[PDB]
Scaffold this motif. Structure first.
Motif: not given
Ligand SMILES: [Cl-]
Ligand SMILES: [Cl-]
Ligand code: NA
Ligand code: NA
Length: 129
Positions: A83-89, A39-54
């Motif tokens: 990084l969440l676009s349907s275009d993975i470039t 899923n290109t729209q996936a996001t998850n927040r990390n304990t240190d306050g950063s976030t993971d995208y795409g």
């Protein structure tokens, strides 16, 4: 966009990831499955306050700018939303920088724990490539 397995393999191949830095295509498909369930729209927040995208769950502490991770680098020089676009470039081009930084695909925890040392060729079996 939620990719199909063979659809994503084909898109990654066209963008130059097959055997990039020695990692066969099945490695990249396996990593995407367990990082984002394709899923290109996936996001998850990390304990240190950063976030993971795409699709490859690229982190805002080092690689992209999301305006809310203090002291972060933007080493891929991109807003994290790209990084969440349907275009993975943009995800692919940034992943190439990450995998070249010294630790290979061990930068992706799910790859180390769920793909490394397994039969990753199974992730592209049956696909027209
Ligand atoms: Cl493979
Ligand atoms: Cl894991
Ligand atoms: Na497919
Ligand atoms: Na950042």
């Amino acid at each position: 966009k939620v990719f199909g397995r063979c659809e994503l393999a084909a898109a990654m191949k066209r963008h130059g990831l097959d055997n990039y830095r020695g990692y066969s295509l099945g490695n990249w498909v396996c990593a995407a499955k367990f990082e984002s369930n394709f899923n290109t729209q996936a996001t998850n927040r990390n304990t240190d306050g950063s976030t993971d995208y795409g699709i490859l769950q690229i982190n805002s502490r080092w690689w992209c700018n999301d305006g809310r991770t203090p002291g972060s680098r933007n080493l891929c020089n991109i807003p994290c939303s790209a990084l969440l676009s349907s275009d993975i470039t943009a995800s692919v081009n940034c992943a190439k920088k990450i995998v070249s930084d010294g630790n290979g695909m061990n930068a992706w925890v799910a790859w180390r724990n769920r793909c490394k040392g397994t039969d990753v060729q199974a992730w592209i079996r049956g696909c027209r490539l």
